[PDB]
Design an enzyme around this catalytic site. Structure first.
Site, PDB file in Angstrom:
ATOM      1  N   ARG A  22      43.480  50.059  36.790  1.00  0.00           N
ATOM      2  CA  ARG A  22      42.841  49.047  37.612  1.00  0.00           C
ATOM      3  C   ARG A  22      42.588  49.575  39.021  1.00  0.00           C
ATOM      4  O   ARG A  22      42.991  50.685  39.359  1.00  0.00           O
ATOM      5  CB  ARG A  22      43.735  47.790  37.758  1.00  0.00           C
ATOM      6  CG  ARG A  22      43.912  46.883  36.511  1.00  0.00           C
ATOM      7  CD  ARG A  22      44.241  45.438  36.973  1.00  0.00           C
ATOM      8  NE  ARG A  22      43.056  44.842  37.569  1.00  0.00           N
ATOM      9  CZ  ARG A  22      43.002  44.128  38.683  1.00  0.00           C
ATOM     10  NH1 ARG A  22      44.092  43.847  39.385  1.00  0.00           N
ATOM     11  NH2 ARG A  22      41.808  43.771  39.152  1.00  0.00           N
ATOM     12  N   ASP A  46      50.997  45.176  39.683  1.00  0.00           N
ATOM     13  CA  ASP A  46      50.815  45.866  40.949  1.00  0.00           C
ATOM     14  C   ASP A  46      52.194  46.178  41.533  1.00  0.00           C
ATOM     15  O   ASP A  46      53.195  46.208  40.815  1.00  0.00           O
ATOM     16  CB  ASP A  46      50.063  44.998  41.969  1.00  0.00           C
ATOM     17  CG  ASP A  46      49.349  43.839  41.342  1.00  0.00           C
ATOM     18  OD1 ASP A  46      48.575  44.073  40.398  1.00  0.00           O
ATOM     19  OD2 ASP A  46      49.536  42.704  41.813  1.00  0.00           O
ATOM     20  N   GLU A 214      41.451  41.004  50.972  1.00  0.00           N
ATOM     21  CA  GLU A 214      40.717  42.245  50.855  1.00  0.00           C
ATOM     22  C   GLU A 214      39.383  42.114  51.557  1.00  0.00           C
ATOM     23  O   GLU A 214      38.520  41.355  51.114  1.00  0.00           O
ATOM     24  CB  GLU A 214      40.531  42.610  49.369  1.00  0.00           C
ATOM     25  CG  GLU A 214      41.820  42.705  48.592  1.00  0.00           C
ATOM     26  CD  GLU A 214      41.607  42.720  47.107  1.00  0.00           C
ATOM     27  OE1 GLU A 214      40.873  41.849  46.624  1.00  0.00           O
ATOM     28  OE2 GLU A 214      42.180  43.583  46.405  1.00  0.00           O
ATOM     29  N   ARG A 230      37.222  38.544  51.250  1.00  0.00           N
ATOM     30  CA  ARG A 230      37.630  37.742  50.124  1.00  0.00           C
ATOM     31  C   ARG A 230      38.316  36.576  50.889  1.00  0.00           C
ATOM     32  O   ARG A 230      38.817  36.759  52.024  1.00  0.00           O
ATOM     33  CB  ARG A 230      38.691  38.497  49.307  1.00  0.00           C
ATOM     34  CG  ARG A 230      39.120  37.778  48.047  1.00  0.00           C
ATOM     35  CD  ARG A 230      40.576  38.030  47.669  1.00  0.00           C
ATOM     36  NE  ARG A 230      40.740  39.052  46.634  1.00  0.00           N
ATOM     37  CZ  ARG A 230      41.564  38.953  45.588  1.00  0.00           C
ATOM     38  NH1 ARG A 230      42.311  37.867  45.398  1.00  0.00           N
ATOM     39  NH2 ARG A 230      41.656  39.965  44.741  1.00  0.00           N
ATOM     40  N   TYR A 324      36.942  43.903  40.025  1.00  0.00           N
ATOM     41  CA  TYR A 324      36.692  44.684  41.226  1.00  0.00           C
ATOM     42  C   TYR A 324      35.483  45.616  41.077  1.00  0.00           C
ATOM     43  O   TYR A 324      35.266  46.221  39.998  1.00  0.00           O
ATOM     44  CB  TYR A 324      37.915  45.514  41.626  1.00  0.00           C
ATOM     45  CG  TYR A 324      39.078  44.751  42.190  1.00  0.00           C
ATOM     46  CD1 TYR A 324      39.226  43.383  41.964  1.00  0.00           C
ATOM     47  CD2 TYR A 324      40.025  45.396  42.960  1.00  0.00           C
ATOM     48  CE1 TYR A 324      40.294  42.686  42.507  1.00  0.00           C
ATOM     49  CE2 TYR A 324      41.087  44.713  43.505  1.00  0.00           C
ATOM     50  CZ  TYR A 324      41.202  43.363  43.285  1.00  0.00           C
ATOM     51  OH  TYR A 324      42.172  42.660  43.966  1.00  0.00           O
TER      52      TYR A 324
END
Ligand SMILES: OC[C@H]1O[C@@H](O)[C@H](O)[C@@H](O)[C@H]1O
Ligand code: NA
Length: 601
Positions: A22, A46, A214, A230, A324
């Site tokens: 990712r 993550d 982000e 974002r 993304y």
């Protein structure tokens, strides 16, 4: 010339050593090599997870890609170390390549505790891998201290994708990499991390906004630096802010309505990076994101030609699942796109011939009419360069039993064109807000807009609040006035906790602003919360505002996110009141996103 769009996967979940791949990051080295970096997630999570920063290299423009090499290796065994979310920044002047990423130990972004000590396993560090040999070997630094000017900044992470080196003005040469911080107040802000000495030292500038995440930066044609964010506060859009300096600060943050986003990452780059300041080419931006507001799908590339003011061009590259996406200008003139299709990370290449085209943004105003009416509204188009277009078409997109037609005069270079749209809507048309798509077809490319045709509703701008039982106004904006603003993202909220206020016989009354013949009311539930949803209602009307007559209607409405009708035999009234009697799941508060009144203006 001939349109181009080709793709191939660089990483496939489960293959080549990791269950999950990712967070894409793309760049082009000074020698013309393409570099693609992404996380390798052994646990599919993550930070604090033991993730690794990988890299694939293409020496033939992106056609063939080399083996997956490791840039920053995470440790799966105790003690657990991880590396996540890469972001490249290439210093075009010196040739150095920087790959920014998160260095985790025990905590991730939401759980990181105050501190700048590389040793403290409870803070999420800000790392940088530096390469002076094209990306082959790297040198690691933990730069948390350098970029945490305020001890309250308890967490940080570099927004993946790719950073920028300024080319214009007095700060030309400066490398900027965007970050997201969690301040002392618990707020999520945006901050630019820059270097004026080609990356030896990095300082952080002044933080911006509330509810950010982000973010991305681009250099405009005049040297200004635009920021595109974002929104963690989920409004279904991008937040934008701009800067004019070199000690870095951005003005107010506002929501951009031409850019729908499901609260996801996105790319925004200069289509012609080496163009001179002030020129037309310097004003052309390319933005990629998922256009859906409820899902991470409908991946679309948009184009601007006036530094981001208007966004006439759009085309979908992935109708399906898309999360993304990151963009990069290739030295052959095309653009490289690295994105997440749900299967891992995939590489794409496209040229401007494939986008559709034409830099001719146009506006068609919002119309209000009564069912059975016809209305004609003007169209204003603003034209670009080598574009003397003698025959352009106007294709409208509406409900099938609505007659919609449009026309535009010819497009001459650097002038504005005129036109008009005729909308006829049938008599049995249900009151509501209607979105109408507009597409300026030309033999040199596409240009699209959308306007709203509102049939059978009174004007909210003439409405005000007559009375309300309670409004939350301390901890948040739960104003009774947020029901009449045309935005489902804002809501009226009954005075909630941190003040044990009243319970359910709740109510809100609207002053319509004059006497009108009304036959209904539509209401929209609060969208991102399910515990203040109105169930049983009763409607009352009035002309004097003190003596109320009803119930004119009663019912229980659903959990539907769209507007719900409450109809009654037409009648004259200057005031309308909604009495909420219960909440869907027995809770104690009421929140209404919007209130629309059906009647004749
Ligand atoms: O107490 C009021 C708040 O309660 C939270 O739990 C909820 O997620 C918020 O949307 C807000 O309603
Ligand atoms: Na609202």
């Amino acid at each position: 010339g001939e349109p181009l769009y080709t793709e191939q996967d660089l990483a496939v979940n489960g293959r080549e050593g990791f269950p999950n791949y990712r967070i894409p990051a793309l760049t082009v080295t000074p020698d013309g090599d393409l570099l693609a970096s992404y996380d390798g997630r052994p646990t599919g999570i993550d930070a604090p997870g033991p993730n690794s920063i990988l890299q694939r290299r293409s020496t033939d423009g992106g056609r063939t890609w080399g083996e997956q090499q490791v840039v920053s290796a995470g440790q799966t065994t105790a003690p657990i170390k991880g590396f996540s979310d890469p972001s490249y920044l290439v210093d075009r002047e010196t040739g150095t390549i920087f790959n920014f990423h998160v260095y985790s130990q025990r905590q991730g972004f939401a759980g990181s505790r105050p501190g700048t000590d590389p040793a403290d396993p409870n803070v999420l560090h800000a790392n940088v891998a530096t390469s002076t040999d094209g990306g082959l070997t790297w040198s690691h630094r933990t730069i948390t201290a350098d970029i945490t000017p305020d001890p309250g900044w308890r967490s940080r992470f570099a927004a993946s994708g790719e950073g920028i080196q300024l080319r214009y003005g007095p700060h030309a040469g400066r490398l900027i990499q965007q970050y997201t911080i969690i301040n002392a107040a618990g707020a999520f802000q945006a901050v630019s991390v820059y270097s004026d000495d080609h990356g030896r030292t990095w300082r952080a500038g002044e933080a911006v906004g509330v509810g950010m995440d982000e973010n991305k930066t681009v250099e405009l044609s005049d040297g200004r630096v635009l920021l595109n964010s974002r929104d963690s506060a989920r409004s279904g859009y991008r937040k934008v802010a701009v800067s004019t300096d070199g000690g870095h600060s951005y003005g107010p943050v506002t929501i951009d309505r031409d850019l729908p986003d499901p609260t996801n990452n996105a790319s925004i780059i200069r289509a012609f990076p080496d163009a001179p300041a002030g020129s037309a080419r310097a004003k052309v931006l390319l933005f990629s994101n998922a256009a859906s507001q409820t899902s991470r799908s409908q991946g679309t590339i948009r184009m601007s030609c006036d530094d981001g003011q208007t966004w006439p061009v759009s085309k979908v590259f992935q109708p399906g699942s898309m999360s993304y996406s990151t963009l990069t200008a290739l030295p052959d003139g095309t653009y490289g796109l690295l994105y997440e299709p749900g299967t891992g990370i995939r590489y794409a290449n496209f040229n401007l011939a494939w986008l559709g085209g034409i830099c001719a943004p146009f506006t068609i105003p919002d119309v209000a009419l009564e069912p059975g009416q016809q209305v004609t509204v003007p169209v204003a188009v603003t034209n670009q360069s080598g574009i003397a277009v003698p025959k352009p078409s106007l294709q409208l997109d509406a409900s099938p039993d609505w007659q919609v037609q449009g026309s535009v005069e010819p497009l001459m270079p650097g002038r504005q064109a005129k036109g008009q749209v005729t909308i006829t809507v049938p008599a049995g048309t249900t009151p509501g807000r209607y979105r109408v798509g507009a597409t300026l077809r030309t033999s040199a490319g596409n240009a699209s807009t959308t306007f709203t045709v509102t049939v059978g509703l009174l004007d909210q701008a003439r409405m005000s609040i007559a009375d309300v039982d309670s409004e939350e106004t301390a901890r948040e904006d739960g104003r009774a006035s947020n029901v009449i603003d045309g935005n489902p993202s804002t809501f009226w909220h009954t005075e909630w906790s941190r003040a044990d206020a009243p319970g359910y016989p709740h109510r809100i009354s609207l002053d319509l602003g004059g006497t009108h013949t009304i036959s209904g009311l539509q209401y929209t539930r609060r969208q991102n919360s399910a515990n203040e949803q109105v169930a049983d209602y009763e409607i009352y009307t009035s002309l004097n505002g003190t003596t109320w007559d009803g119930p004119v209607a009663s019912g229980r409405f659903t959990t539907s996110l769209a507007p719900q009708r409450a109809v009654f035999p037409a009648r004259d009234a200057r005031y309308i009141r909604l009495v909420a009697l219960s909440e869907q799941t027995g809770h104690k508060y009421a929140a209404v996103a919007e209130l629309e009144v059906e009647g004749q203006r």
